[PDB]
């Protein structure tokens, strides 16, 4: 009823600003997030669970619960996803293989994914992929595609391509397009002499990691840049400038990762500048906090404005939302939920924007009245819309979700 | 009646997490904000009105109807103050005295703020202050109160200590003792070798400058630093550690201004630490793009910080809230009625936090819990008691204000 | 004697260590430097001098002796060149035009710049070229080449296209290509709604601005991208991302300048990775102070960063060295003195690097090697070197040149 | 002559020009000793729990060979790198570098866990720096050590603080040189803070608990250091820049300056004139950071530079204290102290070489255009020669050479290890 009531009000006080409620939640329904799977287990993996995150990447943290397996990790994001409204997706990773045997990371197969497929069927979700260029003993000197040894960046080519056929497989079964993101940690620790080389082996990688012709309808190839990660401060083969270059040139998509960039740097800016030369943003949303530290996702000022971003242009193709974090110092599921949670918040925020009225006021100068209007868009009651969207999908409006994180602790956590 | 009925559900919904709201309101109403002058008259001043801004400080835009006399100003705030809720005080500048002929910045007196002091107490409002260091032939070296010239430094410490006597002038007459904030532009636009000189004779200059003991109950000297400015680039005499040290063992007030800082610096996390050092905190809250650009206030990430900082610990008392900006490129009404409103806003929502809980779940390492509960206060219903606020303020709930302002452009300031 | 002296004993320092200082200095004379010619005037220019920098770039100091004219401009520009040893060319912004009647700058005409062009071919100078997209009531909103209107727009395409047809010009008469960059202010202040639209604008405008197809080997066309300006602080149409997709795709050369970034971004890592995508590039290489203040380049880690890079990778035709700053507190032939030579001193020591020694230890993960090589060649004698090039160039080896600067004041600049 | 010898002549003519006498310089830089780290020995395993984990926020990457296993492979290692670095050093101390048989608790330690340092320290002419330490310990698993809430595990690192400060009067005493002991702990939090205050509380009564034994200045000086974001606890530092500045003021002891320790672009060359007017003595810890506190070796660059500059410019000869702080350990150890210390002092003589009078006059006279153009002239002036004579001077390689010492101890000694 108080929910009832508190969202009839919001409707009319949005109706009163030209802002239709329901319009607004029935496009929530339509943007998707895909949860990454990684937040799981902190980023571990099956290949070789026990055995430490390289890349230049941490997980920072010792809270109990992770995930060990396979079915730990579908229990946890199960778990999850029924505290998180609406649409998600799957984001998996190479190493998230399930296999009776081991298997080299350039001989990945479909069928080494299956269980995953079938469980994406039977939960609605989508899947999204990722080959895993780290954490391994050929990612050791800091280098995979763009690596100087012809065999080493053979595997790290062979492994991509595989993982390409994987992706392919995925929007195959599921219908829809898995979009594979393709993140590699190559780079230097201190003051390089030659950032051109590294570079160039990684543009004539990337392009036979490409060859393979697939189907844009089951399959999509992303670029991720970034500045810089621990142990390899220096320089980034693979950076912003790089990608942007590659994905125009080779017309792939490009992704966006949040915590990727400089001081003050925002990815909500670019945006709009990449969407101009690449046919498809991926974007990692991400909260780094003084590095590419991977925090949680926050109902914060860059947040929102991505999803602004997104939202204000009707990016609802063009546009693969993903998580991208892992915070090892809370209940990992929480961390996914609060995350995956805000950053549909956010969109929700967005889309309960009176854009065309703000478009216009800007268009004419109207520089006091946009300021002004923007700022009063947050104080309209948009929790009452959020609180209704919960509720139509059968998940808590409020803090209550964190009873039953607190709940399946007890229950199924505390024992591992 | 719709407000009436947000209301009764927030009060519910707040109620439940232990917050009341109708306390909330009173104590909303016991956190003055200052209304900074400058921001009326793009820093133009009384003394020379048209007569081009110096010190590494800029007003951009060129929007019309800039209040061009005392008169005006009082009009300009008057219209301000009237669509923004509670407590509310100005600051003042002293280019902003008021006399018939001309006076020495070195030998001001109370009596040229007299009538701003009746107005003060027309309008129920509080006095600060500000000696005037730049827009200034004995400025235009870059050097004031860190001036190698015996003569022009002597100027500043006498123009200082007068001012000093205006602000405890004011704190007589107003029963509210006066801030008064000393903020220089000294400092060089590039390589410099000798940056301990001037920070030498600004140190003795300041002693000087305080020497003259005055009634607390009436006044309060307050020091702020700069990291850099418009043409002062490289070097700011007055930096964060010289007026923390000078503050500190001289135990005067600290100012910190939000846009005062390096790249991702923040004033937030500064409060209790300083607090724990100097006597009392003024605060010059700012909105900085890229540089100390004095644009508007938003209700963003560090406004929010900030309010929390402040009331998270009761500091009502130590604390005194100040606004710092001057976008000339937006209705200057308009302008102040944003600042000061996100201002107010930030602290309301603070005052609706349950601090006591969330303190005690941190202080178990719940840190799961923390953040959850952080996040789900956004979505809490704040915006609700806002609203209730603001009406019970006789002040617009919401964008309507705008049509206020717009009213009073039209008939006044399309008159300028 | 003495610097003969010198020479001899660091040309066999250098030879012990692999390196042919005969060499470098050959080398270093294959290397110009496009002198920015803004840089004497404070960016005034002779259509409207005495008038207004606008474009959220500024000029501080009120140094005296600007030049005034195309005349006292060249008779500058000469005193600093006699000054500086070897290769340079002249960079003209279109606002330099030489013309009885004032020009459209829509309308600018080669013939504008014969004496520039007739001046350059008998000071053996090459010359760029610029549109000038600032300091103009077409320009007075912020937006030039995106704006929403058609008629502004077109007004500022055509300027573009004229302004290539004029750098032809330059490059048919030289005999060495005009490289013209485009550089626009457009952007916001504050938060802005829509940051797709003037993108997609400023895309098509360029596509129109280059479409006349003109000789390579006269003309070469460069955009430059920029992060925030004064008074365009939030958003820049013509972003990174917006002009490395630009470049990429049109194949156009893309424009470096070292005080367009976020803090912290360099572009000497920019360089080669851009160069695998743009045929061409252009740096404008400047010292920013927390801003895009445009302070003299110095000998420093970056301007060093960014000569390596050209020279480690030979990239001695497909880049395009340029300076750009413009102080105008101190001398400005000082100025330009001190910065070219600056970039000429970071050059030679690039050449003077152990370059294929320390790729080849990289190569085989001795970083030991590495970094202490890389640190040991900051104490050769490159100066030894130096001096020697300018004695060659019958140039002050050291700080004499200040004397004919301070001369050149005395006897010309202070009868300005 | 020697080339070296030609070259210095010719220096010393060009110097003499400009009015800088070249022996005055060399006489002064002998008066500037850059105290060495000794963690970046062994990445800061220490001694207590050598292999078992960093901790703290601050982390050591890099899997190069050869790191020091206890006080004596240290020792050797020092002893390699001080040859090749000329002039004065002295050596900085941790407590988890202590020598015992049994194991000590931290807040136990004595002067008798670091008489073998001490005794080495006399032999070599070091004198000794030191500090507590706060991490890589099971009592800031938390992330809170002197701000810790718990009693006991605040009453434990205030404990070990306090008993620091005697082995470090005790180091004073000893060498007849204060021991500089400087204060860092890594408390703070990793996201979304609710209470910054109780922790700051916590921690400003526990220092003034830990300086509360009166000591003797001309033997041992208390400093404290901030840091404004660690790794597992980026979003709040207890010890924040301004929680230290306002310490080190109100209770007179020295501030600790780490050049990785804060912002995007912000310098400590800058905070040293500053923080002097208010605390009495400046501890500076040289660092390179790149895009955070990484400690990468310092090199002869921008920020080294005015740093130094900013020294012998106010000729603070006694009150600045000139430390060195990295720990990269994807490199030969032993190079990664010559090239940071050697740089060091590479810049300090810089400064020594630099005509401040003439530069200050210039700048005090609005002469900007000569000050500027000065100073980049001084760039080109040979002051290299110089370095090179400092350098024999101090029977240390002048230039590359020192490698190849490094590499045949790395093949004899450390390809050992
Ligand atoms: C697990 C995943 O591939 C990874 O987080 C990348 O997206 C990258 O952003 C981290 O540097
Ligand atoms: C007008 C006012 O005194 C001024 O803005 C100062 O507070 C300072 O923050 C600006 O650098
Ligand atoms: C004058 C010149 O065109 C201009 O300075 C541009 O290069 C740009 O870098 C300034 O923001
Ligand atoms: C080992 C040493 O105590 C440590 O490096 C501190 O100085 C601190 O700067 C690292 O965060
Ligand atoms: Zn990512
Ligand atoms: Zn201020
Ligand atoms: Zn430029
Ligand atoms: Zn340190």
């Not at 101009?276 to 925090?295: A, G, I, M, T």
């Not at 693969?320 to 996914?336: C, E």
């Not at 009225?357 to 109207?366: F, H, I, N, V």
Request: with cysteine; charged share 25%.
């Amino acid at each position: 009823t108080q929910l009832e009531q508190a969202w009839e009000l919001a409707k009319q006080r949005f109706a009163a600003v030209g802002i239709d409620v329901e319009e607004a939640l029935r496009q929530l329904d339509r943007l998707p997030v895909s949860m990454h799977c990684w937040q799981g287990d902190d980023v571990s993996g099956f290949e070789n669970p026990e055995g430490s995150l390289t890349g230049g990447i941490q997980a920072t943290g010792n809270y109990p619960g992770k995930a060990r397996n396979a079915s730990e990790l579908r229990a946890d994001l199960e778990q999850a996803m029924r505290l998180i409204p609406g649409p998600k997706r799957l984001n998996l990773h190479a190493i998230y293989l399930e296999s009776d045997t081991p298997v080299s990371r350039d001989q990945i197969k479909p069928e080494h994914f299956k269980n995953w497929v079938e469980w994406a069927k039977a939960n609605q979700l989508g899947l999204d992929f990722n080959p895993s260029c780290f954490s391994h003993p050929l990612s050791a000197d800091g280098f995979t595609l763009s690596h100087a040894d012809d065999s080493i960046r053979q595997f790290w080519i062979d492994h991509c391509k595989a993982s390409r056929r994987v992706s392919a497989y995925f929007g195959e079964q599921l219908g829809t397009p898995s979009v594979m993101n393709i993140w590699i940690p190559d780079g230097m620790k201190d003051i390089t002499v030659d950032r051109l080389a590294p570079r160039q082996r990684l543009l004539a990688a990337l392009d036979e990691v490409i060859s393979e012709k697939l189907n844009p309808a089951h399959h999509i190839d992303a670029v991720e840049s970034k500045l810089f990660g621990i142990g390899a401060e220096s320089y980034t083969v693979g950076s912003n400038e790089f990608y942007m270059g590659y994905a125009t040139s080779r017309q792939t998509a490009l992704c966006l990762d949040a915590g990727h960039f400089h001081p003050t740097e925002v990815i909500s800016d670019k945006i709009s500048a990449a969407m101009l030369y690449v046919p498809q943003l991926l974007l990692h949303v991400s909260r780094p906090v003084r590095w590419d530290s991977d925090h949680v996702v926050l109902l914060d000022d860059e947040t929102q404005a991505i999803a602004s971003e997104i939202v204000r242009h009707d990016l609802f193709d063009r546009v693969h939302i993903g998580l991208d974090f892992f915070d090892a110092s809370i209940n990992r599921i929480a961390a996914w939920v609060i995350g995956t949670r805000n950053m549909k918040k956010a969109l929700l925020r967005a889309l309960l924007e009176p854009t065309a009225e703000l478009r216009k006021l800007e268009a004419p100068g109207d520089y006091t009245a946009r300021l002004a209007l923007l700022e009063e868009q947050k104080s309209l009651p948009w929790q009452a819309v959020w609180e209704m969207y919960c509720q139509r999908h059968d998940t808590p409006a409020g803090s209550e979700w964190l009873e039953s994180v607190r709940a399946y602790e007890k229950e199924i956590l505390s024992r591992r």
